[PDB]
């Protein structure tokens, strides 16, 4: 129904502010292909697929670059292969949120060795966000979310039975992800306001 193997397959299948904006734009195209590979997403009404991706893209990308950065020392590995370290983050004005990414997401993913199936399932939970405004039938989206976390729980309890609290521990990174996403979006809106975003991009559409 919502097999974690399919969610894993979807994961495996896919100036510092210029670098940040170019990386986010690159990954937006990839994110659409990722979402189509999540079971039942493409069966939602098209206008609801649009709503979910507009509501969730930023958290979905942040989760992915955070997990990608586990092997980086005190930094973020952007999808372009460029790193953001502390000096660049401060030059971009994003030093405080950079620190939160490292302490609340990257380091916690690293400490618990969050795996790619778990990451993919948390991202599918964020994708299937039933609070997204304007959905034709929010409960259908909640139903898909509940299928994801039922599958995630069964996966964690089979693979990590000596860690009974692991499923809840994964879900309890999502408030941090929500906060962090709101602040990153604030920064991106500011980069757009002052004209530091590349123009004519998919990122600009997401910010409009």
């Amino acid at each position: 129904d919502m097999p974690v193997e399919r969610i894993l397959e979807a994961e495996l299948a896919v100036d510092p502010v210029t670098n940040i904006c170019q990386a986010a734009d690159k990954q937006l195209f990839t994110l659409v292909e990722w979402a189509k590979r999540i079971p039942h997403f493409s069966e939602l009404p098209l206008d609801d697929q649009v709503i979910l991706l507009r509501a969730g893209w930023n958290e979905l990308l942040i989760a992915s670059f955070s997990h990608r950065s586990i092997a980086v020392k005190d930094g973020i590995l952007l999808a372009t292969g460029l790193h953001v370290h502390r000096n660049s983050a401060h030059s971009a004005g994003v030093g405080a949120i950079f620190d939160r990414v490292l302490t609340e997401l990257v380091s916690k993913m690293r400490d618990m060795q969050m795996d790619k199936t778990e990451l993919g399932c948390l991202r599918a939970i964020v994708l299937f966000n039933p609070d997204s405004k304007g959905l034709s039938n929010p409960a259908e989206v909640e139903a898909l979310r509940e299928k994801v976390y039922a599958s995630l729980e069964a996966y964690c309890k089979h693979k990590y039975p000596e860690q009974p609290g692991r499923f809840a521990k994964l879900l309890l990174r999502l408030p941090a992800l929500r906060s962090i996403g709101l602040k990153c979006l604030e920064h991106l809106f500011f980069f757009k306001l002052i004209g530091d975003t590349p123009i004519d991009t998919f990122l600009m559409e997401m910010l409009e």
């Binding site: 195209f29 659409v32 189509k36 493409s42 098209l46 697929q49 649009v50 991706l53 507009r54 997401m206």
Partner: peptide, 11 residues
């Protein structure tokens, strides 16, 4: 939202 709505239909 022309880019996203097109990419969702592009196979």
């Amino acid at each position: 939202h022309k880019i996203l709505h097109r990419l969702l239909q592009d196979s």
